[PDB]
Scaffold this motif. Structure first.
Motif, PDB file in Angstrom:
ATOM      1  N   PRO A 235     -24.772   5.806  45.059  1.00 19.06           N
ATOM      2  CA  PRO A 235     -24.637   4.267  44.745  1.00 19.06           C
ATOM      3  C   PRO A 235     -26.096   3.813  44.365  1.00 19.06           C
ATOM      4  CG  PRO A 235     -24.601   4.639  47.066  1.00 19.06           C
ATOM      5  CD  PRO A 235     -24.422   5.913  46.602  1.00 19.06           C
ATOM      6  N   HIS A 236     -26.943   4.654  44.895  1.00  8.89           N
ATOM      7  CA  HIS A 236     -28.683   3.928  44.890  1.00  8.89           C
ATOM      8  C   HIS A 236     -29.291   5.121  45.138  1.00  8.89           C
ATOM      9  CE1 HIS A 236     -29.430   4.420  48.935  1.00  8.89           C
ATOM     10  NE2 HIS A 236     -30.316   3.665  49.017  1.00  8.89           N
ATOM     11  N   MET A 257     -30.464   0.251  38.591  1.00  9.29           N
ATOM     12  CA  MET A 257     -30.281  -1.271  38.091  1.00  9.29           C
ATOM     13  C   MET A 257     -31.512  -2.051  37.476  1.00  9.29           C
ATOM     14  SD  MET A 257     -28.226  -4.768  38.333  1.00  9.29           S
ATOM     15  CE  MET A 257     -27.403  -4.864  39.880  1.00  9.29           C
ATOM     16  N   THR A 258     -32.677  -1.772  37.659  1.00  7.66           N
ATOM     17  CA  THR A 258     -33.855  -2.659  37.231  1.00  7.66           C
ATOM     18  C   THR A 258     -34.722  -1.398  36.859  1.00  7.66           C
ATOM     19  OG1 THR A 258     -35.046  -2.432  39.386  1.00  7.66           O
ATOM     20  CG2 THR A 258     -33.633  -4.280  38.804  1.00  7.66           C
ATOM     21  N   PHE A 276     -25.652   1.142  37.770  1.00  5.68           N
ATOM     22  CA  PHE A 276     -24.584   0.956  38.619  1.00  5.68           C
ATOM     23  C   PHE A 276     -25.250  -0.623  39.346  1.00  5.68           C
ATOM     24  CE2 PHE A 276     -23.032   0.616  43.105  1.00  5.68           C
ATOM     25  CZ  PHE A 276     -21.646   0.448  42.775  1.00  5.68           C
ATOM     26  N   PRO A 277     -24.161  -1.680  38.986  1.00  5.70           N
ATOM     27  CA  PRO A 277     -23.014  -1.564  38.283  1.00  5.70           C
ATOM     28  C   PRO A 277     -23.199  -1.789  36.832  1.00  5.70           C
ATOM     29  CG  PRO A 277     -23.116  -3.266  39.776  1.00  5.70           C
ATOM     30  CD  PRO A 277     -24.389  -3.021  39.719  1.00  5.70           C
ATOM     31  N   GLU A 279     -21.451  -2.949  34.282  1.00  9.03           N
ATOM     32  CA  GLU A 279     -20.683  -3.999  33.593  1.00  9.03           C
ATOM     33  C   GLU A 279     -21.858  -5.257  33.644  1.00  9.03           C
ATOM     34  OE1 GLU A 279     -17.336  -5.358  35.410  1.00  9.03           O
ATOM     35  OE2 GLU A 279     -17.737  -4.332  37.403  1.00  9.03           O
ATOM     36  N   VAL A 280     -22.908  -5.133  34.707  1.00  9.37           N
ATOM     37  CA  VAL A 280     -23.451  -6.133  35.084  1.00  9.37           C
ATOM     38  C   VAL A 280     -24.881  -6.224  34.105  1.00  9.37           C
ATOM     39  CG1 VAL A 280     -25.308  -7.082  36.653  1.00  9.37           C
ATOM     40  CG2 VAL A 280     -23.135  -6.453  37.654  1.00  9.37           C
ATOM     41  N   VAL A 281     -25.453  -5.312  33.676  1.00  7.98           N
ATOM     42  CA  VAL A 281     -26.523  -5.156  32.760  1.00  7.98           C
ATOM     43  C   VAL A 281     -26.060  -5.083  31.424  1.00  7.98           C
ATOM     44  CG1 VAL A 281     -28.159  -4.305  34.511  1.00  7.98           C
ATOM     45  CG2 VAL A 281     -26.909  -2.711  33.494  1.00  7.98           C
TER      46      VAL A 281
END
Lengths: 348, 347, 348
Positions: A235-236, A257-258, A276-277, A279-281
């Protein structure tokens, strides 16, 4: 066609009589030259299997690598998938003979390129199984990431399965297999997740790849690789895990994610990342990362669906990870959903 | 039924003459048995008084913690809110006499579970007041974290207050309290925010909980506490603030935005996180974190509005932090928007 | 008219006969008084020559800085651009005469304020050219940061160049400069960005500012500043690049995306941050950051286009970093779209 068939045999007999090594690699290009002028399926198969014995007798990597480019060109010129399946199995024989990994990297990129221009799934199932063996036959520090990157480039879609009953889960895993997407990823949240990835290891021998996801601890990851997991999605980014996958020879695609988390993931040697996620980015993120970070690709696994996956691949993603939009429901219905996602990817 | 009062008084007098601790723990079970067969509000609230009378005579930790479960079960079976109000005050007195973290933790979850099934604003105000006092006792790190977690579950909405004067902040906080918002966060953008949280301390006696938001440094956090704040809210994750908040006995909810920041926040010991800005990641982020992080709950304090606040709680969110969309305007406007947010959260 | 011009001659001759610094200080406010009452391009630009002319009593950061506010006030009330150009050059000579850090920093904010009332752009190009010389007079860390903030406050738009050759990068840089974009960022995706920065260093004397972007290592950053780069831009926060950029006297805008990355950049001494990718977080991010962090400015360099840039500045962004939407295409196309970006920012 029997005239040129004898011509391929005459080049062989005269190349073997010629003790010079230059005439050996020259016979490779001579056989490839006449194969470019041909249009029959059986002619190209005899020509490809002929180039095998020439380079193996030469005993030099320069002839083996030159043979890999010759068979790959003949496979691109062909039209019958029967020749493409033999070309992939031949490239494995050439790269295994050298074993210096300079050809193993070239062989993987050739096998994945042949599977890219394939009309049916049989060729892509042959490829994934060979690239797994190529990385397995290599058994070193690299190649596994190149296999992972290329296999994802071939399978395009990787499912995210989760069900409390292993009887229902395998009913969905075979079901998503039936759609032809291959490369199924099983979540580790499922209680008996160790067993599901071990009993589904028979899909590995038919052109699929099984892996574990949502893995958070080294202890959990050790349980996955002992059960048959070939990739750990995660997940990370985890520093302790990433060092365990490299020692165990398993591919690891951490979650970022960044752009700042992206750089820290590259500092540990991970250019195959999980968005991940996703859909957010959104697909705007992977488009914006191409400039500052080329040759770096992601696998977005978030809220990807049939309306999303069309615009994820136009942005240049390696593969996409779908979960509830594909696997949730009755098995026979997710077979039709697995066919729908493959049809949507092949178009846009 | 008046016959039950006799039988209840017979069970006490009979087990009291016995004196054996085996019979005393059986007396709690006998009183709780008849309370399940009755539907009278006065029969149930008398049984709660007797269960306390039996447990504090036994004195053992085992009997006191059993009495907590019995009183909590009588509350779940009752309909009158005055029975629930009496149960909460008794649960406090049982854990107060007992001591130790196990009883005080069990009491925190009990009085908060009663507040949810109460469906009344008065009981939720009492639950906050009691849970603050239970956390004031013991004062352990796990107590203030659990008390803050259960309080956020009860109030569901925390008000991010911003104004241009101390008096305008006092009137807005009182207005949002009259609407039904029991948790008030005072940002340090308001001038003399330490004076605002100090003079608003009278709300904590009526069922409220005032805290400080927009805390960036430890000097800023040290002034937030000692001035009366009961929780500290920061836009990011601060390693020194979490240290000072732990040793000072004050709840601390840091800000996160990515799963990588989430794991780093868990490593510090915080599983109640502030999602900021919540409008950027959206409720899709909360649903996505439930998989690999189930025991982590968020409080989004971004663009939370009457439109999206319904979708936030549908994603399994602990509480929401609203501002501007709630605290902007006249005190009358704040009071009506406060009633609107509480109404839409009930769903 | 010239009846006021004769009065200014008398104010200087009479105050010089006195010699007392209190009468020379009063002579400045007397000239600025009658200059405030007149509306003449020749009366104003002569009144500021006399205010500079009254340097007989060395301010030593007292009278000289009073002259700066007076000439900056005369330029504010003026309308002719020739007065604004003369005001900027005079402020430079007054601050250069003082040499104190306060006068130099006060001159930066004065010159940048003169350029904000724009119309004719030669003032803006002169302002950037003067503000660079002021920073080189001071050479302090506070001077480089303030000058970089003020230049972006004036130029409003940064061009992020990405090319496939040195000649195409040079031609597009000249094209965006002639369009009105005075800030140019040379990415390291260009093959030889250092030579591109080096051959474009002549633009810095015409009112431009050349810098390097997508810098990942300190070796990359040192080559950029040795080539002529005046600001370093990275997609993330690099602690070692910030260290080197400090001791080298070069501005450095790191990339942040979450509020925690924002704080880690502030504690290193960076309040001018690169919001990247800006299109992912949107202007809702910068509006929400001003609450806890009012001193941070941000320059969003994401999917900025003509439809985006209008609503980015309404949220109070310092400048915007534009690429692809501004750099891609022939050099003739990117000139006219640079004029459109400058014109779109002037309105909303």
């Amino acid at each position: 066609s029997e005239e040129e068939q004898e011509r391929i045999r005459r080049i062989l007999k005269e190349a073997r009589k010629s003790g010079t090594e230059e005439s050996l690699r020259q016979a490779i290009e001579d056989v490839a030259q006449l194969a470019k002028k041909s249009q029959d399926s059986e002619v190209l198969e005899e020509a490809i299997r002929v180039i095998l014995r020439i380079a193996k007798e030469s005993g030099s990597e320069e002839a083996l690598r030159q043979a890999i480019r010759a068979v790959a060109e003949i496979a691109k010129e062909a039209q019958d998938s029967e020749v493409l399946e033999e070309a992939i199995r031949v490239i494995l024989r050439i790269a295994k003979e050298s074993g210096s990994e300079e050809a193993l990297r070239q062989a993987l990129r050739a096998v994945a390129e042949i599977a890219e221009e394939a009309k049916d799934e049989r060729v892509r199932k042959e490829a994934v199984r060979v690239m797994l063996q190529i990385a397995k036959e290599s058994g070193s520090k690299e190649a596994v990431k190149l296999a992972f990157e290329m296999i994802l480039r071939v399978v395009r879609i990787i499912a995210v399965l989760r069900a409390n009953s292993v009887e229902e889960a395998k009913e969905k895993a075979l079901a998503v297999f039936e759609g032809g997407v291959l490369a199924i990823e099983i979540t580790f949240t499922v209680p008996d997740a160790d067993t599901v990835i071990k009993e589904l290891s028979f899909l590995e021998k038919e052109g699929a790849i099984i892996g574990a996801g949502t893995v958070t601890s080294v202890e959990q990851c050790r349980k996955a690789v002992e059960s048959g997991a070939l990739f750990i999605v995660s997940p990370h980014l985890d520093e302790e895990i990433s060092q365990f996958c490299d020692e165990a020879g398993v591919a690891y695609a951490p979650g970022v994610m960044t752009p700042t988390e992206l750089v820290k993931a590259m500092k540990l040697g991970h250019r195959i990342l999980k968005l991940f996620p996703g859909e957010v980015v959104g697909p705007q993120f992977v488009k914006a990362m191409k400039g500052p970070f080329p040759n770096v690709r992601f696998v977005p696994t978030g809220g990807v669906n049939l309306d999303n996956v069309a615009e994820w691949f136009k942005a240049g993603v390696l593969a996409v990870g779908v979960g509830s939009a594909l696997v949730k429901g009755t098995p026979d219905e997710v077979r039709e959903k697995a066919k729908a996602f493959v049809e949507k990817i092949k178009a846009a």
